[PDB]
């Protein structure tokens, strides 16, 4: 879904600030030609819409959309690809239209799309084209949100933007309830190695698969184990076949990052109760059981790249070695004999990765420095240590040492004698603050990871995993997640409806080999032709017990929960089930960011913000307004002089703190003197 995006206005088009909202609205010819659901939710709403599912580009650069043509009521199978023009020449029926199972409709008055962007009822003779299927107007990512027809468009927007933000877990287990789009969406995304020609496995491994084709030839398939993606996440490829396996052409042979068994898998299936629990799930916060932390159910891998280079300079040339001035062998005990750290060395914050030293030159020293050198007998150490240090917060083992050299005659930038990249990876567990979400935009950070004993547990002894908030469900109009929860419980426990009357009435249009189901069996509700209310409740009637005779969930869908903390049963039963949630790429250590005293800017004297640095916070304009409104003059003076720009004031603040003395008076800010010098330089006598 970073492929197949349509950018509406940009280079060779209108500017983002210049464009109004006439571009941002959805013209009624977007049906089947551009998805109205999937868009960025920021300022770029409606400018960046993805392609549809069945859409196809014309040679003339137009967006064809296929249609089953209907002739004399009989809808044929002549699929005709139509542009917007021939859309507007005709009238178009819908897929939710009762066919006779022989081509014709059974009702003469059919829903239809009038060519002026209108909807009419029509005699069943004048329509000449029908949609190929449902879900024709939806995106690829939005085609994977089940129970979409119950959800609201805003929360579907948040869910479709939430789908392409998951991180690949280490287990990568498939959802118990999906659509029919996960499988083809996986094998067309390219991140799964496909069995190209139909053959038999000659040898399986962990890095390669030697298929043996049916005519002599062989082929390996080199897995990319632990490849770094463009956002730090892992890209493993575990093979799925065994030694004597005969494969077919176009078959999945190795799951990628977010794939299980061939099909897509963005998260795990999790038990969930919808009660409000002790204010920890307050205002769209989520709690989790500790079983996720201990059992490694939600655990990503972040392969991070650090990179330093050995250039030349005016005073000589920088060099990479073990020798670092004024340093001990204790910090040096991990790097190799030539300076880099070895593979598998665990690092922490502020360790050395590449011991790098440059010629400082020779300067005059302070007399106290000279006296300490004379006392301890040490030399000047005339070469400056500027070694690569692993920055703040990052840790984990060192996977790879990618090192290049100009002396090894590779191509290198001008002046760089050696380039060395070091890949560090941390196996991040789940934690409080990690932004979790469902598949319907029901997002929320993890409020508190409870231990598994004081987590509200189901009446057989099963503790639930997460506990959502009730009040986030109705006022956001995304009860698609509640229907998904009920269906997830149904598909988890399995069912077998009665056959004494054969088909009960709700089970009529319900297709066959669904009247019974084994437990832990996956199902797929498609987007606009899926499960209904009557089918869901009737299937939830017979919901075969766990191991004993214990129907844990009533026909209402709820269940009786004993409180793990207090001990009493909860006085009203609570909706449970198996929601399919994911873990998103908004983790805490990507965001938590503090600074006491770090680097500064160059032209201005402000602390250089940004998490790449230690980084301040932009104390903006409205914050100045609010602290004016409190009347707090002194704190405003601190924030605008001696935490920001008073150069001689800052070191006096530091001295007064570590000496434990009173904070001195703020001096003149540096930016004001900059303004004074500019205004004097504009031939204005600023007396």
């Amino acid at each position: 879904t970073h492929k197949r995006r349509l950018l509406a206005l940009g280079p060779g088009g209108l500017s983002r600030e210049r464009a109004g909202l006439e571009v941002r609205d959805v013209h009624p010819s977007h049906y089947g030609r551009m998805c109205p659901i999937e868009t960025p939710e920021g300022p770029n709403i409606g400018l960046i819409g993805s392609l549809s599912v069945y859409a196809r580009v014309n040679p003339f650069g137009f967006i064809e959309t296929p249609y089953r043509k209907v002739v004399d009521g009989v809808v044929s199978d002549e699929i005709v690809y139509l542009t917007a023009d021939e859309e507007d020449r005709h009238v178009v029926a819908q897929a939710n239209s009762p066919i006779d199972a022989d081509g014709r409709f059974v009702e003469p008055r059919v829903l239809v799309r009038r060519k002026a962007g209108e909807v009419e009822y029509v005699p069943s003779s004048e329509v000449d084209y029908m949609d190929v299927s449902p879900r024709q107007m939806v995106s690829v990512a939005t085609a994977m949100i089940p129970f979409l027809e119950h959800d609201d468009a805003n929360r579907a927007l948040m869910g479709a933007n939430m789908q392409r933000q998951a991180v690949p877990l280490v287990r990568s287990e498939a959802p118990l309830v999906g659509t029919g789009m996960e499988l083809r969406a996986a094998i067309d995304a390219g991140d799964v190695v496909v069995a190209e020609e139909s053959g038999v496995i000659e040898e399986v491994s962990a890095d390669y698969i030697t298929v043996m084709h049916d005519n002599g030839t062989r082929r390996t398939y080199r897995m990319r184990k632990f490849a770094r993606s463009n956002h730090g996440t892992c890209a493993n490829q575990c093979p799925i076949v065994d030694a004597g396996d005969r494969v077919e052409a176009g078959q999945v042979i190795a799951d990628g990052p977010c794939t299980d068994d061939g099909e897509m898998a963005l998260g795990k299936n999790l038990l969930v109760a919808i009660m409000p629990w002790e204010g920890h799930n307050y205002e769209d916060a989520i709690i989790l059981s500790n079983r996720l932390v201990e059992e490694d159910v939600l655990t990503s891998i972040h392969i991070e790249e650090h990179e330093i280079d050995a250039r030349d300079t005016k005073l000589g040339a920088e060099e990479i070695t073990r020798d670092i001035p004024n340093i001990s062998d204790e910090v040096l005990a991990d790097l190799d004999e030539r300076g880099i750290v070895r593979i598998g060395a665990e690092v922490r914050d502020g360790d050395i990765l590449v011991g790098k030293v440059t010629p400082k030159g020779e300067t005059e020293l302070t007399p106290e420095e000279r006296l300490l050198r004379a006392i301890f007998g040490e030399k000047a150490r005339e070469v400056r240590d500027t070694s690569l240090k692993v920055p703040h917060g990052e840790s984990g083992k060192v996977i790879g040492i990618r090192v290049f050299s100009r002396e090894d005659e590779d191509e290198l930038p001008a002046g760089v004698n050696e380039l060395v990249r070091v890949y560090v990876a941390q196996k991040r567990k789940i934690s409080d603050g990690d932004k979790l979400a469902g598949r319907h935009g029901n997002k929320g950070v993890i409020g508190k990871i409870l231990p598994v004993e004081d987590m509200p547990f189901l009446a057989d002894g099963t503790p639930v995993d997460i506990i959502l908030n009730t009040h986030g469900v109705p006022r956001r109009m995304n009860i698609g997640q509640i229907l998904e929860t009920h269906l997830g419980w149904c598909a988890h426990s399995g069912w077998k409806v009665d056959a004494a009357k054969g088909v009960p009435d709700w089970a009529a249009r319900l297709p066959d080999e669904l009247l019974e189901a084994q437990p832990n069996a996956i199902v797929s509700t498609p987007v606009f032709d899926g499960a209904q209310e009557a089918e869901l409740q009737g299937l939830l009637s017979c919901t075969l017990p766990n191991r004993d005779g214990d129907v844990l969930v009533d026909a209402d869908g709820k269940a009786m929960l004993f409180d793990g903390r207090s001990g009493e049963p909860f006085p009203y039963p609570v909706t449970v089930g198996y929601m399919y949630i994911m873990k998103l790429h908004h983790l805490v250590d990507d965001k938590i960011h503090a600074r006491s005293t770090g680097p500064y800017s160059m032209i201005t004297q402000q602390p250089l913000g940004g998490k790449a640095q230690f980084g301040g916070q932009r104390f903006g304009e409205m914050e100045c307004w609010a602290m004016q409104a409190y009347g707090a003059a002194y704190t405003l003076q601190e924030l605008l002089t001696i935490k920001s720009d008073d150069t001689v004031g800052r070191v006096k603040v530091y001295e007064a703190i570590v000496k434990g003395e009173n904070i001195p008076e703020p001096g003149i800010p540096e930016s004001f003197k900059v303004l004074l010098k500019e205004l004097q330089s504009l031939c204005l006598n600023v007396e």
Binding site: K3, R4, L51, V53, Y54, R56, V57, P66, R68, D77, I79, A95, N96, V132, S133, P134, V140, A174, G178, G180, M181, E182, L183, R184, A185, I187, D188, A189, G190, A195, I240, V247, E248, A249, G250, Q251, V252, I253, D261, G262, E263, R509, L510, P511, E513, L514, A517, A521, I522, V523, S524, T525, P526, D529, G530, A531, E535
Partner: peptide, 27 residues
Amino acid sequence: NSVPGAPNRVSFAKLREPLEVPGLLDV
């Protein structure tokens, strides 16, 4: 269906659509 290594994902799909999903990166 129509893919050899697909898992047996049962469906509630009442409508039978004759057109298959295209080769998504054809654009």
